[PDB]
Each structure stands twice: as structure tokens, then as C-alpha cells.
């Protein structure tokens, strides 16, 4: 049919959103439009990475599930049993997206569960729901097309995390490479006095501890701030803020 | 009726290849199978990023340009004029994938040109060729859906190449931070004597013609070999080989 | 007679001035040697000096930071040469090997009490000149690494933005209107925002706003735009 | 005795480049003529050299606990401490300890003992600074290599060295593909990226598999998260 129309739009979104970064919200919105049904891109753990509502049913049980952006733990592990595409599931199924729970009112309450694979592993679960039309081969082409693209974008987000988790640690260590012996001993006792990420630094409370100059403490802060690890601010008679997630971790290796 | 059957085949490859290739040969092979037509994924400058033949054509006019993995300059800048899916462009054209001398046999010979765009930038050009019948909405979906994925895969490669081209320089620079002054000036004169990637390191004069210790050259070479920059092999009278594309470039800064 | 008192002092200055090197090391010798000090580079440059009596001859007077050179006998003076050149005298102790220490004084002529305070110092100087280079190549290369790390975090579009951003600034600092760059190539402004963050994350730049007037950006790395000028 | 200042001059006027203060201990031991014992503040024998071998555990790396704490509160130069003479000179900006049964301890012997005690400090600080230099750089390269990976081969690398259970070992081809379900070409691309940064140095051995040897001290550790 003129399914070609609904694919060009789905493609047109992807044909700019391609590259960085990954936006599951705007992506689920387009699926919601071209599949003409509710969309729930669900993580392995049951977390909602993105979603979009085409037809909204007024139910405190459901809209709440959407509020934590988390599905019930029992229902989450149930998706693992679904290995292949399971189309048009009934309101009396253990997989339905319609715990209404007066299901007589919901005769046309349908549910489609397409697993989201990145080849090597099941990365998530695409959940559909609709009250108007049956899920045909037409609606499955768009659902599976999307599920494949989601899988790539989940594997990308997970790849880019591992990349940056290591990159951030790398620049932290290079910043440490800059320090002298005293400057390191300085930095250690500095962030012990703070005991966290933010705080005010009493530079006179140190520099008497070991007899090392307060000017040494200045180098140690500039070198870190030079590599963007921190950023200090002149505050009365010094405020420092850590700009790196892994800085505190790598520092705690005495 | 199932276009779905032809989409599952295409989807099956895509997810089961998300694990980092990128392989345009594998992609082209499947398209050629599900689209049921010849596939030519063309780079911006005419290079074939990938291909797969469904129907063996008979001219060595094409069998040589295919053997060269490169399209003519004239035909390439012709592809820029195509801004959107052009379907079934005769054999009488300037866009046809069948440039022949004997055209009277290729009346049913056709061509379809789907552009490949991402981020806003025209990345490549998908080209289809078939003798059978005209490309239907059936094939146009599979063509456009493929051309969309090829787009975001080209963008992956360009971002991962930057990821690597810059990382490689970082490893080089990090190895240079290990050197002393004498250790550095040694490396400078070593690869001034080589005048290339590989060569034999005499150093019987090269070291003491300028007056550089033969032991400080070892430490300098061991440090470079530590970061995987180089790799030396032994002999009576040392052979060296640069394993980093960007090492020489970064070293050309005094 | 106890030279220990004069060598305990000199030593108690180097333990404190351990690392972070010659402007203050020259003051060190000028005090304990009690003579003018001139720490001269292998090629003439003044790495540090300190004056004790200050002959106001002005055939010499140092903001040149470079002598009228060629001076070449520090060439030729391979050993400590005491009391060269009234008693306007000079002691020249070599540091060159693998710079040069020059002492000047009106009065005594170093005695034998001695250059052993100068030779002692002249050795420590050499170790700190060797420290200078090692702790320079360390930083000059590591900075280039941080920059390349920052660039590796960019996408193709995020890079295209950066290439244009600092092609507009025409220098180190300046105001940036993120408005128009998005219109010159047709890429999202959020891309420009994302690109600037990745640089600012590694401390390459700083980027804080000026309202709708624009965003002010200041490059904090000496090696950024250099490495950026490579295709 | 200006040559006696020139002894200590060119003995470490090399100076330089790396830090080998075992070669420093004999420099003092030859010229102060002494048994030299460069001791860390906590107790480890950072270096030593013996001119006068005594018919007398140095084997090794630390001293008697409350002999070290005795040295700690020797805040000043104290020569001829008897018991076989003894001289203890502080090293701080470590501890230098001398001993002899010969020309006592001259105050010229003290000059060279005190002057050396200063140069030691500088080279302890230099060694310590250029060690933290290394230890951090040794981690930076590992993390650099790890950033090159993606989802699958991080998981591949995680399982590989988990099975290796140590530094070196043989990897049985595709026996590993069972336990992660990813293409096994992924494993190769993983091992290649690591050894491209000097983290490993592998070797293929035909139908047996592939041998691998970790070359980075900090790789095994940093990989342990997870």
C-alpha cells in the first residue's frame, strides 16, 4: 500500500538524527505517529528509555507506571520470554499493555511486543498498544524497522559510555602526572577536608599540617584546573568544584 | 502477503552487525538479495563503498569500472543533481546504470538512484540496477530503508575514525612525555637517519657523530616501543619499524 | 675554621628549592658565596642572576637575557678557572656537559674556601637544567595529548562547528554568537553547544555566557588551535 | 682538596636522566670513604655501599621498627655517635647514615656528607615525582586503549583475562565465543586495539590458538571495574 509514505517520514527523522546524539523521546514520537499506536521503548531492567502516547486511556495504575518511567519488575522479566515478535496480544495475556483492569470495556485493547536485539544480545523491548486497529503486516514492518534502529542506538549509547568512562579516567591520570610529590600530598589532604564534590577550602588549615607552602597548594589546583578536572572561585578569606566524575575515584588509590 | 519476509532478512543482518564493523559488502549482499536487484553504494567522490551483483551484465565497459571500484567523474557529479528518489530511469539517460553500445536489448534495463544523507550532509548515493521489471513501492521501501541505514553507518565510521585518528596521536604524545631531553634528541636524529618508516640503525657514528649515548638510545627506543609506537628486531649489525601512522607527523614539531 | 656553616646554609636552600627551578638559586649563591652570580646558558641566555655589589659600568646592564655573543672560551674553559681578569675579578665554573656558572667580585679572589661552594652549586645547577627540559617535554607533549583527547570526543558535525567557531574568533578570545554558525552550514545549535562542552570538559577552553549577546570563550590551552590547524 | 670537591662533582655531573642512586651510594662510600646507608623515613634501605666491610639483616627492604623511629627524631647533623663510629644526617625538604673505623669523622667529611644528603633529597623528590608521573601515565595509556573498545569487546576483554586468571596464558581460539555470544572476530579486534597501545604483545600459534602477555602494570587493575 502507501506504507511508503509512513516509512519516508520515519526515515526522514533518522536521516538527520543520524550521528550524535541519541534521543529516544523524539524517536518514540515518530513511531507513535507512523505506527499509529502507543510506544514504550523498554530497557532490559524495565526502564523507559523513551515513549510516546497516541491514545491516552485514563487510568491511575498505568499513567503512574509511566511516571517512574519504570515497568513492574515482574512484567519486565516476562518480556525475556518473548524471543520472537508477538503480535496482537489479548487483554487477557500476561504481556498486555492494558491492566485497566475492567477489561470488558477494552475489547480492542491490543498489545505488540517486538524484542530489541543488537545481534549479540537482547538490548531492550519495544512495547506497543492500540485501541483502534488490528496489528497487520503493515504495522509490523514499521515496528520491526524501528526495533532494529533502536537496537543500534542502544548499542551506540552503551559503546559511547565505555569510551567516555575510560576517556574521563585518562585525562584525570594525566592531570595527576603533572603533580610533584608535595603537590600530590597537597591535593590528597585538600579533598579530605572537603569530603565530597563541593566545599570551601581553608588553605590556612592546611600548609601548617606538613609545612608545605600554600603556594604549592596553588600549583596543585591550577594543574588540575588546567585539564578541566576542577574549577575554583575566589571566595572571601577558596571554593572548588570538581568537573570530572572519576577524579575522586582515581584519587582514592593511595 | 509479506514484504515483512524480505524486511526480516534485512533487519536480521543489521542487528547482527551492530557489533562494530562497518561492512558495506555484507550490507550490499543482503540488499541485492531482498531488493532483487544490483546494488552500488557510491561514495561522494565516486568510490564504491560496497556492491553486490544480482544480474551479471555483459559489458567490460562496466566490468572494468566495477573492477576499479570507481565511477566516472562525469557520472558522479551527475548524481548530485538527484536530490530525491528517482525511479526507473530508462536506459536512455545520463543516470542509467547501463551505459551500453548495444542498447536495443536493454529496453527493460532500469535504474533507481536513492541519495544517502545524514546530519544534513549528503553522504553517499545508493544505486540500483535491474533488467526484470520496474521498481515498485515494494522495492522502494527496502531501498530507502537501506539507504537510511547506510547513512548513519557512514556517520559512525567518520566519528569512529576521528575517535581513532586523534587517539593514535594521543598515544604518540603520551610516549613523548616519557622522554628526557637527550632521549628525545636521540629519537629526532634516529629517524632523521632513517628517512622513512623502517631501516637499519647503525648508531656507530650516528650516535657519536653528534655525541649521543648508545644506552640512552636504547631507553629512548624502549619507551617508544612501550606505547606500541615502534617495534624493533635484532641482528648483529638494530632494525626498526614504525607502527603508528601519526608518529612521524607529530614528531615533525621542533 | 668551619666551612660547614657556609655549606649547611647553601644546602638548606636547595632542599627547600628542590624542584621548581635559577632566579632564586642565583640569590642563593649571591648570599652564601657573597659574589655576583651569572648563570649562563649553553648558548648565552641568562637562566638566572643575582647581584651583590653591582659594578655600574654599563658595558653590561642583562634584560637582554642574552650576552653580546659570541662571548667562545667556556668552549675552551672546560675546567674551573679561578680569578681571571684593581681587583675586579672573575671565577668561571663550567656546567656544560652530559650551561656555565660565572662569578664576579671586587675584593677577595675566592681564596681556597672556595669554588668548592661554586663547584657544589654548579653541579646542582646542571641537574636542574636537566630537570627543566624533562619537565618541559613532559608538559609540552601532554598538553598536545589532552587536546587530541578532546578532539577524539567530537562527531563530524561537532568538529565542523569547532573548525568554524575558532575561524570566526580570529584569535584567543572573543564573543561567540552561536546563532549564525548554525545557519552558515545548517547544523543544530545544540551541536555547537555540545562541541564546546567537550572541549571545556578537558580544560581546553572556558565558555560562559553574556546573555543573548552571545557566549564568551577563552582558550586555556597553548596547543589547541595549533593541532586544530591539521586536516 | 678542591679535587676533593671535584670528586663528588663529576661523579654525578652526568647527572642525570634516570635515577640510579645505587650508583650514588658508592660515590659517597668511595670518597667520604664510608659505609653509606641511604634509608627511607619509614625504614627501607633506598641504597647502600660498603667501603669498610665489617665482620658482621641487610637482605632487605626495611629496618628495625624502633630503630627507624630513633632516626626520625634525629633532627640535626650528629657525627661520631659511637655505638664502630656512626653519623646520621637527615634527608628532607629519608635519612643518611654513615659508619667507619678509620679517620674518625672529619668536618670536611661532614661537608661532603651533608652536601650529599641534600642531593639525595632532590633525587628522591625527582624519583618520587617522576614515579607518580609514570604510575599515572601507565594508567592513562590503559584507559586510552579501553576507550577504543565498544560494548561487545569490553565484554570480550572482560571475559578473556577473567579466564586467563593471571598475566600470561594461551587463549583457545573460539572456545570463548560460547560464553558471550558475540562474533569471535570481535575478540581479535579487541586484542589488537590493546596491543596497539603496548598493553599486550600477542602471538598466533596455528590450530592451538593465541598466546597473550600483559605488558602494562595497571591494565589488570583498571579492568577490574567491572
Q: DSSP assignment of D61-120, as one string?
A: S---HHHHHHHHT--S-B--------EEEE----EEEEE-SSS---HHHHHHHHHHHHHH
Q: What are the b/e assignments for C13-39, b being 16+ CB within 10 Å?
A: bbbebbbebbeebbbbbbebbbbbbbb
Does the beta carbon of D195 lie under 8 angstroms from any beta carbon of chain B? yes
Orientation of helix C115-152 relative to helix D107-147, angle to 10°: 10
Write down the H helix ranges in chain B.
4-15, 24-34, 62-65, 73-78, 137-176, 181-194, 214-226, 247-251
Residues of chain C neighbouring B156 (CB-CB closer than 8 A): none
What are the C-alpha distances in Å from C113 to residues C90, C119, D112? 15, 11, 14
Peptide bond into C20 cis (omega under 30): no
For residues D140 and B175, give the distance between their C-alpha atoms in angstroms, rounded to a whole number: 11
Q: Which of residues 148-177 of B touch A (CB under 8 A)?
A: 148-149, 151-152, 155-156, 159, 163, 174, 177
Name the 3-class secondary structure at C44: coil
* Residue A138 in grid coordinates: 503493515
Q: Give the helix/strand (H/E) hosting C132.
A: helix C115-152
Point out the residue among C137, C151, C157 whose CB comes nearest to the CB of B179: C137
For residues C31 and C47, give the distance between their C-alpha atoms in angstroms, rounded to a whole number: 18
Backbone angles phi, psi at C170, to 5 degrees: 60, 30
For residues C101 and A41, give the distance between their C-alpha atoms in angstroms, rounded to a whole number: 74
User: How many C-beta atoms surround the C-beta of residue B109 within 10 A?
Assistant: 20
Residue C153: name the closest of A167, B49, A48 by CA. A167
**C217 within 8 A of C197, measured Cβ to Cβ:** no
For residues B162 and B3, give the distance between their C-alpha atoms in angstroms, rounded to a whole number: 38
* Residue C211 φ/ψ region, left for φ over 0, alpha for ψ in the -120 to 50 degree band, beta for the rest: left
Cβ within 8 Å, pair C220-A243: no
Does the beta carbon of C127 lie under 8 angstroms from any beta carbon of chain B? no
Task: Name the one residue in this structure whose C-alpha cell is 546530519.
Answer: B119
Backbone angles phi, psi at B199, to 5 degrees: 150, 175
Q: Give the helix/strand (H/E) hosting A77.
A: helix A73-78
Orientation of helix C189-201 relative to helix C156-168, angle to 10°: 80
For residues A1 and B146, give the distance between their C-alpha atoms in angstroms, rounded to a whole number: 19
Give every CB contact of residue D94 below 8 A, 6+ residues apart in sequence: D38, D39, D40, D41, D46, D120, D121, D124
For residues A133 and C141, give the distance between their C-alpha atoms in angstroms, rounded to a whole number: 64
DSSP for residue B60: T
**D158 within 8 A of D191, measured Cβ to Cβ:** no
For residues D221 and D87, give the distance between their C-alpha atoms in angstroms, rounded to a whole number: 43
List the subunits that have 3+ CB pairs under 8 angstroms with B: A, C, D
Q: What are the b/e assignments for B21-38, b being 16+ CB within 10 Å?
A: bbebebbbbbbbbbbbbb
Backbone angles phi, psi at C207, to 5 degrees: -145, 90
Give every CB contact of residue A49 below 8 A, 6+ residues apart in sequence: A24, A41, A42, A43, A124, A154
Q: What are the b/e assignments for C144-158, b being 16+ CB within 10 Å?
A: bbbbbbbbbbbbbbb
Task: Name the one residue in this structure whose C-alpha cell is 509490523.
Answer: A140
Give every CB contact of residue A195 below 8 A, 6+ residues apart in sequence: none
Residues of chain C neighbouring D126 (CB-CB closer than 8 A): 19, 131
User: How many C-beta atoms surround the C-beta of residue B223 within 10 A?
Assistant: 20
For residues B87 and B75, give the distance between their C-alpha atoms in angstroms, rounded to a whole number: 17
**A126 within 8 A of A115, measured Cβ to Cβ:** yes
User: How many C-beta atoms surround the C-beta of residue A48 within 10 A?
Assistant: 21
Residues of chain A neighbouring B152 (CB-CB closer than 8 A): 14-15, 18-19, 152
D218 CB-contact burial (10 Å; exposed 0-12 / middle 13-18 / buried 19+): buried
Determine the straight-line distance between the first and last CA of chain D, rounded to whole angstroms: 63
User: For chain A, what is the radius of gyration of the CA atoms?
Assistant: 26
For residues A185 and C37, give the distance between their C-alpha atoms in angstroms, rounded to a whole number: 34
Peptide bond into D15 cis (omega under 30): yes
Determine the straight-line distance between the first and last CA of chain C, rounded to whole angstroms: 69
Distance, in angstroms, between C207 CA and closest chain A CA? 12
Cβ within 8 Å, pair B167-D183: no
Task: Say what the alpha-carbon torsion angle B83, B89, B95, B101 is, to the nearest 10 degrees.
Answer: 180
* Residue D15 in grid coordinates: 647527572
User: For chain C, what is the radius of gyration of the CA atoms?
Assistant: 26
Secondary structure tally for chain A: helices H, strands E: 8, 8
Task: Name the one residue in this structure whose C-alpha cell is 579466564.
Answer: D163
**B205 within 8 A of B198, measured Cβ to Cβ:** no
How many Cβ contacts (< 8 angstroms) between chains A and C? 39
Name the 3-class secondary structure at B112: strand
Strand order in the sheet with D210-213: D168-171, D210-213, D203-204
What are the C-alpha distances in Å from D217 to residues B226, C139, D140, D187? 12, 23, 12, 22
Question: Please, which residues bridge with residue C212 across strands?
Answer: C210
Backbone angles phi, psi at A126, to 5 degrees: -85, 115
Name the 3-class secondary structure at C40: strand
Cβ within 8 Å, pair B11-A144: yes
User: How many C-beta atoms surround the C-beta of residue D85 within 10 A?
Assistant: 18
**B42 within 8 A of B125, measured Cβ to Cβ:** yes
Does the beta carbon of C144 lie under 8 angstroms from any beta carbon of chain B? yes
| Half-sphere exposure of residue A147: CA atoms within 13 angstroms, side-chain side | 31
Residues of chain D neighbouring A158 (CB-CB closer than 8 A): 150-151
For residues A150 and A146, give the distance between their C-alpha atoms in angstroms, rounded to a whole number: 6
Residues of chain B neighbouring A3 (CB-CB closer than 8 A): 3, 137, 141
Strand order in the sheet with C215-219: C175-176, C215-219, C205-209
* Residue D209 φ/ψ region, left for φ over 0, alpha for ψ in the -120 to 50 degree band, beta for the rest: left
Peptide bond into A101 cis (omega under 30): yes
Task: Please give the biggest Cα pair distance in chain A.
Answer: 82
**B94 within 8 A of B78, measured Cβ to Cβ:** yes
**B36 within 8 A of B143, measured Cβ to Cβ:** no
Helix then strand then coil, % of chain D, to nearest 5: 45, 15, 40
Question: Please, which residues bridge with residue B158 across strands?
Answer: none
Point out the residue among B167, B182, B229 whose CB comes nearest to the CB of D17: B182
What are the C-alpha distances in Å from A114 to residues B34, B149, D107? 22, 19, 89
Give every CB contact of residue B31 below 8 A, 6+ residues apart in sequence: B10, B39, B52, B142, B143, B146
Name the 3-class secondary structure at B235: coil
User: How many C-beta atoms surround the C-beta of residue D75 within 10 A?
Assistant: 8
Residue C113: name the closest of C10, C202, C12 by CA. C10
User: How many C-beta atoms surround the C-beta of residue A133 within 10 A?
Assistant: 12
Q: What is the separation of C-alpha C153 from the centre of its chain, rounded to a whole number of angstroms?
A: 31
**What resolution in angstroms, rounded to 1 decimal?**
3.0
Provide DSSP, A131-168: SSS---HHHHHHHHHHHHHHHHHHHHHHHHHHHHHHHH
Determine the straight-line distance between the first and last CA of chain A, rounded to whole angstroms: 67
Question: Please, which residues bridge with residue A89 across strands?
Answer: A111
Residues of chain D neighbouring A173 (CB-CB closer than 8 A): 136-137, 139-140, 143
Give every CB contact of residue C224 below 8 A, 6+ residues apart in sequence: C147, C199, C204, C205
**In chain D, ranges of CATH 6.10.250.380 domains:** 107-148
User: How many C-beta atoms surround the C-beta of residue A60 within 10 A?
Assistant: 7
**In chain C, ranges of CATH 6.10.250.380 domains:** 112-153
Residue A128: name the closest of A89, A155, A78 by CA. A89
Topology of domain D107-148 in CATH is 6.10.250
Name the 3-class secondary structure at C19: coil
Experimental approach: X-ray
CATH for C112-153 (3.30.565.10, 6.10.250.380, 3.30.460.10, 3.40.50.2300): 6.10.250.380
Residue C165: name the closest of C150, C184, C147, C145 by CA. C184
Cβ within 8 Å, pair C137-B181: yes
**D159 within 8 A of D179, measured Cβ to Cβ:** yes
User: How many C-beta atoms surround the C-beta of residue C181 within 10 A?
Assistant: 19
Amino acid at each position: 500500500m502507501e506504507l511508503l509514505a509512513k516509512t519516508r517520514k520515519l526515515n526522514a527523522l533518522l536521516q538527520s538524527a543520524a550521528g550524535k546524539p541519541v534521543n529516544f523521546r523524539e524517536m518514540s514520537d515518530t513511531m507513535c505517529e507512523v505506527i499509529e499506536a502507543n510506544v514504550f521503548v523498554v530497557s532490559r531492567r524495565g526502564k523507559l528509555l523513551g515513549y510516546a502516547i497516541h491514545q491516552q486511556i485514563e487510568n491511575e495504575r498505568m499513567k503512574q507506571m509511566l511516571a517512574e518511567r519504570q515497568f513492574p519488575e515482574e512484567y519486565t522479566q516476562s518480556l525475556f520470554n518473548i524471543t520472537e515478535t508477538s503480535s496482537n496480544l489479548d487483554v487477557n495475556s500476561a504481556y498486555t499493555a492494558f491492566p485497566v483492569e475492567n477489561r470488558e470495556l477494552f475489547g480492542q485493547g491490543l498489545t505488540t511486543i517486538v524484542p530489541i536485539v543488537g545481534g549479540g544480545e537482547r538490548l531492550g523491548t519495544l512495547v506497543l498498544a492500540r485501541l483502534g486497529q488490528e496489528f497487520l503486516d503493515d504495522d509490523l514492518i514499521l515496528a520491526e524497522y524501528s526495533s532494529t534502529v533502536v537496537g543500534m542506538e542502544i548499542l551506540r549509547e552503551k559503546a559511547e559510555e565505555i569510551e567516555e568512562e575510560a576517556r574521563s579516567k585518562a585525562v584525570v591520570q594525566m592531570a595527576i602526572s603533572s603533580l610533584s610529590y608535595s603537590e600530590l600530598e597537597a591535593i590528597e589532604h585538600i579533598f579530605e577536608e572537603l569530603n565530597g564534590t563541593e566545599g570551601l577550602l581553608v588553605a590556612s588549615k592546611i600548609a601548617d599540617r606538613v609545612g608545605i607552602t600554600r603556594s604549592v597548594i596553588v600549583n596543585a589546583l591550577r594543574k588540575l584546573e588546567s585539564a578541566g578536572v576542577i574549577e575554583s572561585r575566589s571566595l572571601g578569606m577558596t571554593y572548588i568544584k570538581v568537573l570530572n566524575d572519576k577524579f575522586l575515584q582515581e584519587l582514592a588509590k593511595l
